[PDB]
Amino acid sequence: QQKKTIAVVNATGRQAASLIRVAAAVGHHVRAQVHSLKGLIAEELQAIPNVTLFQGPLLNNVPLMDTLFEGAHLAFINTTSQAGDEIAIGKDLADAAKRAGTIQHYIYSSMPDHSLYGPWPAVPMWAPKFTVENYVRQLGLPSTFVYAGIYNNNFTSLPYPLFQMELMPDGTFEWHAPFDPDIPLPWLDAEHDVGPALLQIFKDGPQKWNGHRIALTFETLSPVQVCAAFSRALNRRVTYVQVPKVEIKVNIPVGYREQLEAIEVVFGEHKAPYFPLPEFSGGVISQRVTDEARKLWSGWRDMEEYAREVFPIEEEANGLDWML
Ligand SMILES: NC(=O)c1ccc[n+]([C@@H]2O[C@H](COP(=O)([O-])OP(=O)(O)OC[C@H]3O[C@@H](n4cnc5c(N)ncnc54)[C@H](O)[C@@H]3O)[C@@H](O)[C@H]2O)c1
Ligand SMILES: [Cl-]
Ligand SMILES: [Cl-]
Ligand SMILES: [Cl-]
Ligand SMILES: [Cl-]
Ligand SMILES: [Cl-]
Ligand SMILES: [Cl-]
Numbered sequence: 567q568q569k570k571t572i573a574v575v576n577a578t579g580r581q582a583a584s585l586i587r588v589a590a591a592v593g594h595h596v597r598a599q600v601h602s603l604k605g606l607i608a609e610e611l612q613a614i615p616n617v618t619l620f621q622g623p624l625l626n627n628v629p630l631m632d633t634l635f636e637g638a639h640l641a642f643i644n645t646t647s648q649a650g651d652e653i654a655i656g657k658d659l660a661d662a663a664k665r666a667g668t669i670q671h672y673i674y675s676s677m678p679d680h681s682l683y684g685p686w687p688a689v690p691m692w693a694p695k696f697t698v699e700n701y702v703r704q705l706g707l708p709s710t711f712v713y714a715g716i717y718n719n720n721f722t723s724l725p726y727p728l729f730q731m732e733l734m735p736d737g738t739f740e741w742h743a744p745f746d747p748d749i750p751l752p753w754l755d756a757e758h759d760v761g762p763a764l765l766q767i768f769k770d771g772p773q774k775w776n777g778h779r780i781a782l783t784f785e786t787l788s789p790v791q792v793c794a795a796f797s798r799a800l801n802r803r804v805t806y807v808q809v810p811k812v813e814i815k816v817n818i819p820v821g822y823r824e825q826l827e828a829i830e831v832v833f834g835e836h837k838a839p840y841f842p843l844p845e846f847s848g849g850v851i852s853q854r855v856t857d858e859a860r861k862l863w864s865g866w867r868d869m870e871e872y873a874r875e876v877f878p879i880e881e882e883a884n885g886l887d888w889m890l
Pocket of ligand 2: 568
């Protein structure tokens with residue numbers, strides 16, 4: 567029963583970092599790729615004895631992938647669009663894993679392609695991952711796909727798009743977005759809950775989870791309910807305002823702009839589900855989107871805890887002063 571070695575990429579990202587911290591603490595050795603060794607998170611992870619970092623780009627660097635998977639038995643792969651070529655990278659990684667011959671369970675962090683379920687456009691930073699998921703499914707090794715809910719800690723009072731908990735002149739907070747005020751959205755405390763859930767999937771094993779899609783969300787809340795949780799947590803007035811166009815108050819990469827534009831159409835105009843797949847939609851009991859995740863990890867944290875216990879600290883660390 568010796569803890570198996572786990573290979574991961576984008577180690578400094580919230581999903582991977584969450585898994586690495588808890589995995590290492592319970593005995594797993596981790597082989598982790600990082601784009602660069604500098605930075606608070608990379609430095610923190612390098613200081614963990616059970617962790618070995620491998621710095622370099624994923625883009626057109628299969629050699630790094632072969633190195634990463636050498637001696638690994640488990641994998642948790644979450645890519646990004648940063649370098650472009652996310653589909654090619656996700657496929658290269660999967661091929662490298664299969665090539666290693668030792669990967670018993672490959673978990674890929676996937677997202678939906680909304681254009682497959684309704685008269686909706688594909689959200690650009692999500693649809694590509696589904697393509698990688700389809701490719702991975704065809705490979706001869708067990709694989710499981712996790713779909714991340716919206717991160718509680720996307721929220722900030724800095725003028726960043728879509729998830730700004732704006733501090734008003736009078737001390738009150740307002741969150742403006744295209745999401746319908748009352749339709750429940752899936753949320754996730756990435757930092758605390760992704761790691762433990764992923765570890766449980768690995769503990770459960772490939773026979774139980776091969777071919778499965780798991781919604782990594784532990785609570786659903788409408789925008790109005792999110793604001794009410796921040797209000798209870800902070801003892802301040804927090805209200806939601808639905809706006810057709812995302813308020814883009816800072817310069818952003820074009821790819822992100824296109825992501826936001828698709829979101830205005832999908833959620834603003836169409837009010838489509840965040841998880842549009844059929845399976846995520848006397849005595850008879852239908853499965854709720856949060857069922858599997860909660861069964862995987864019972865110690866999950868809600869939005870109210872985030873708002874009251876973590877948000878003030880993240881905000882202070884970002885230089886904000888409202889909590890002073
Ligand atoms: N924020 C959410 O609510 C949410 C929900 C579902 C899915 N996702 C998906 O999560 C993915 C990101 O994963 P994450 O949340 O674990 O990470 P992250 O957003 O926490 O950070 C990514 C890290 O990767 C580094 N990085 C990645 N590619 C790089 C490159 N080519 N050059 C330099 N640095 C690079 C960045 O500096 C950064 O520190 C995205 O593809 C997104 O679509 C996010
Ligand atoms: Cl193990
Ligand atoms: Cl990284
Ligand atoms: Cl870095
Ligand atoms: Cl180390
Ligand atoms: Cl398969
Ligand atoms: Cl700017």
